């Protein structure tokens, strides 16, 4: 739910864009959001 609130739309926008802001958002997502998902995967 926390990811879907804000983080998931950012990831979707980054995926759609595939810019400096886009690169920064992608780096943020890959360094903060998905590590938590991997930790909570079990």
């Amino acid at each position: 739910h926390v990811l879907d609130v804000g983080f998931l739309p950012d990831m979707r926008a980054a995926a759609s864009l595939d810019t400096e802001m886009a690169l920064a958002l992608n780096r943020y997502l890959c360094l903060a959001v998905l590590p938590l998902i991997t930790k909570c995967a079990p």
């Binding site: 400096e20 690169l23 920064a24 780096r27």
Partner: protein, 137 residues
């Protein structure tokens, strides 16, 4: 840090970036960074360009620091390869646990065999991949 960068490597980097430093103050712009990366022999990626921009105008000593970081990454890869190769004392991909413990005891780091006994057990013959994973934790 620049100890990872070799004397020949830092000399070559300085020779390549002397053109950038010839501008008057060494303030290398994005175009100068692109030309320096092209002259380095490897095309920089988008992440590398973003990191250089964030660390920046960029400077010739900053280029030296980036080259030193790249050399450190190369040295880390070489150390990983050395851990994968040398640890296979048997040479068949499965090093003996006793041989690995003896090698660890007789090491420059002067590590304790009893202390690292649990790590050695976790890893009869310890696989080379298992030894590399244990070394890299």
């Amino acid at each position: 840090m620049a100890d990872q960068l070799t004397e020949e490597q830092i000399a070559e980097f300085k020779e390549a970036f002397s053109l950038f430093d010839k501008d008057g103050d060494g303030t290398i712009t994005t175009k100068a960074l692109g030309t320096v990366m092209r002259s380095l022999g490897q095309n920089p990626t988008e992440a590398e360009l973003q990191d250089m921009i964030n660390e920046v105008t960029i400077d010739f000593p900053a280029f030296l620091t980036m080259m030193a970081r790249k050399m450190k990454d190369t040295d880390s890869e070489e150390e990983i390869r050395e851990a994968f190769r040398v640890f296979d004392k048997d040479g068949n991909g499965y090093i003996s646990a006793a041989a690995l413990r003896h090698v660890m005891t007789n090491l420059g780091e002067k590590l304790t065999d009893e202390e690292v006994d649990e790590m050695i057990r976790e890893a009869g013959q310890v696989n080379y991949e298992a030894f590399v994973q244990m070394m890299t934790a």
